[PDB]
Ligand binder design. Structure first.
Ligand SMILES: O=C(O)c1cc(I)cc(I)c1O
Ligand SMILES: O=C(O)c1cc(I)cc(I)c1O
Ligand SMILES: O=C(O)c1cc(I)cc(I)c1O
Ligand SMILES: O=C(O)c1cc(I)cc(I)c1O
Length: 581
């Protein structure tokens, strides 16, 4: 890295480089229009090229963040558009970058990416590069911690979507479901990555490593610990870089990691073969999403090393991180059936148990039961997975979301309704994602995914702290975030939001809404019902919401939708309150 920009440019190649720089900028400057960003990345890419041509050219030896940060800081109306980021631009690197990062907007609340399949295919044909670029921009700026290389990957998917659908007859129906599925994948990936970044940010790299160790151990149970460690080290670096906005380095290192992993796929997992026969983004993505390898038949019994060995305390004092790390690896690799956070909690408990036991007189007698300390850690979420998947399976996603929305509005009524609705909806999306899964997968799926949504909440909460319960759950141990949240009950301290009839007042407008947004409106109402009536049981809320849904469906099916809403809503608005006592 004589010229780090030349280096990244050469490594990544212009398409990916430009894409990542676009992502980077879009993420750092989420409000600057697409075209601004494009000129920004073109300038940066031109400069990258100039540097690759001659790495001794002036400023070519400046760091990527110096370079890009500078480019960002040159944007038109940086102070009017980003009064916060202005000050960042006053700052040198890495302070500047740290500032930009800090001012990343996790909830830019930009317009909903909705297909305009005619206009968009049009723009995809007019310039597919400007269109996929635009996509990178849109998604990136909506998700300023979106995993850059992954975004490029998704850009590829998105392209494929417009490649397949734009020529198609019902381009809209060929495309929208793809784009919808893609948004779900985006949202999920964004959340995954945001979690990673949040984890660095809020818990540090060790937390991320522990997480990755657990995860990768599950994913690559056959890989030995050194291997998982190496990959976790690298992957953590990749995520660290991506999260710290070092997207070129992140991508480059990710590519390297993918290469490494694929070079060692037999040392790592048989599930990689499909990933490693893919091109670089697709390969990386595939490894990132790779299904867990089969448990090896030679998984070591764990009691000997981790419970029975008489010098465990010695190992544990002598090499805490390595011993624990390997414990985590072992437990995790044998526990794809556990969420990562469960494995971490288990690791934490294993650690806590050595801490306890090893400070005790006969540590071996004490930690010999260590594996048994994990049991309640396992049962708690397994029980929730069952409780909630039962519920989900019983009531379906909407009502599950309602459930969650109620629960979370209860837990954190201070949270904006849109956020509760979002979180509860995403949380219910866990029901959909995880409850249908093979039973051994629901727990990992659901807790991992809840980690994402909770992190989302946390992330949103960072920006918009409204609840201390949220803060605590979000900032106390990450492994416990989900249990912390799950454990949250009705914030008793919450003064019920004053009643605003209007809030629960629907109008014919809701009828034009696609069912998702109709639901969201209802679910917002729902959150509001909770906020106003926090102690309303979830069942009262459900009935009231059912009443609202009923009235909404009715009045929407009405000849005069609005007369209907106007006549029936108020009574409903008033009565539903009595139903929430
Ligand atoms: O328009 C887009 O760029 C777009 C992008 C995604 I990701 C999802 C949907 I639905 C979209 O319409
Ligand atoms: O998710 C990722 O960012 C990721 C990327 C690569 I390359 C390898 C693994 I394992 C991952 O988990
Ligand atoms: O709502 C929960 O607290 C919850 C927790 C877990 I772990 C799994 C599922 I599915 C849930 O719904
Ligand atoms: O379907 C449910 O079980 C459900 C659960 C809760 I908690 C709140 C609402 I509204 C519901 O509709």
């Amino acid at each position: 890295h004589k010229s780090e920009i030349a280096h990244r440019f050469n490594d990544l190649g212009e398409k990916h480089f430009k894409g990542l720089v676009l992502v980077a900028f879009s993420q750092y400057l989420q409000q600057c229009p697409f075209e601004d960003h494009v000129k920004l990345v073109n300038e940066v890419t031109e400069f990258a090229k100039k540097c690759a041509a001659d790495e001794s050219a002036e400023n070519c030896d400046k760091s990527l963040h110096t370079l890009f940060g500078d480019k960002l800081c040159t944007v038109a109306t940086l102070r009017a558009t980003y009064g916060e980021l202005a000050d960042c631009c006053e700052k040198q690197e890495p302070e500047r970058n740290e500032c930009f990062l800090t001012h990343k907007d996790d909830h830019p609340n930009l317009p909903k990416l909705k297909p305009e399949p005619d206009a968009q295919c049009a723009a995809f044909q007019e310039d597919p590069d400007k269109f996929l670029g635009k996509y990178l921009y849109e998604v990136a700026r909506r998700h300023p911690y979106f995993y850059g290389p992954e975004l490029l990957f998704h850009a590829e998917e998105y392209k494929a979507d417009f490649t397949e659908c734009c020529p198609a007859d019902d381009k809209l129906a060929c495309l929208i479901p793809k784009l919808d599925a893609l948004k779900e994948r985006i949202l999920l990936s964004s959340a995954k990555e945001r979690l990673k970044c949040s984890s660095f940010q809020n818990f540090g790299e060790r937390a991320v490593k522990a997480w990755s160790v657990a995860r990768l151990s599950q994913k690559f149970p056959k890989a030995d610990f050194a291997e998982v460690s190496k990959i976790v080290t690298d992957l953590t670096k990749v995520h660290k870089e991506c999260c710290h906005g070092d997207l070129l380095e992140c991508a480059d290192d990710r590519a390297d990691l993918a290469k490494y992993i694929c070079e060692h796929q037999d040392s790592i997992s048989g599930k990689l073969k499909a990933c490693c026969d893919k091109p670089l983004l697709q390969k990386s993505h595939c490894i990132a999403e790779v299904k867990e390898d089969d448990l090896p038949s030679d998984l070591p019994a764990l009691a000997a090393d981790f419970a029975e060995d008489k010098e465990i305390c010695k190992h544990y004092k002598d090499a805490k991180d390595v011993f624990l790390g390997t414990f985590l690896y072992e437990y995790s690799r044998r526990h794809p059936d556990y969420s990562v956070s469960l494995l971490l909690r288990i690791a934490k408990t294993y650690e806590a148990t050595l801490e306890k036991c090893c400070a005790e007189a006969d540590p071996p007698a004490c930690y010999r039961t260590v594996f048994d300390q994990f049991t309640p850690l396992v049962e708690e979420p397994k029980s929730l997975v069952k409780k909630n998947c039962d519920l989900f399976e019983e009531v379906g996603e909407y009502d599950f979301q309602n459930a969650l929305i109620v629960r979370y509005t209860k837990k954190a009524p201070q949270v904006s309704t849109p956020t509760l609705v979002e979180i509860g909806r995403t949380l219910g999306k866990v029901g959909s994602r995880c409850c249908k899964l093979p039973e051994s997968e629901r727990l990992p799926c659901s807790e991992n995914h809840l980690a994402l949504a909770l992190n989302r909440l946390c992330v949103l909460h960072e920006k918009t702290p409204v609840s201390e319960k949220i803060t605590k759950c979000c900032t106390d141990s990450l492994a416990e975030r989900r249990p912390c949240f799950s454990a949250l009950e009705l914030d008793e301290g919450y003064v019920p939001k004053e009643f605003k009839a209007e809030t629960f007042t629907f109008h014919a407008d809701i009828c034009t809404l696609p069912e998702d947004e109709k639901q969201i409106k209802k679910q917002s109402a729902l959150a509001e019902l909770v906020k106003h009536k926090p102690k309303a049981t979830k069942e009262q809320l459900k009935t009231v919401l059912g009443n609202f849904s009923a009235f909404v469906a009715k009045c929407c099916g009405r000849e005069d939708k609005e007369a209907c809403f106007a006549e029936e809503g108020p009574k409903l608005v008033a009565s539903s309150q009595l139903a929430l006592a």
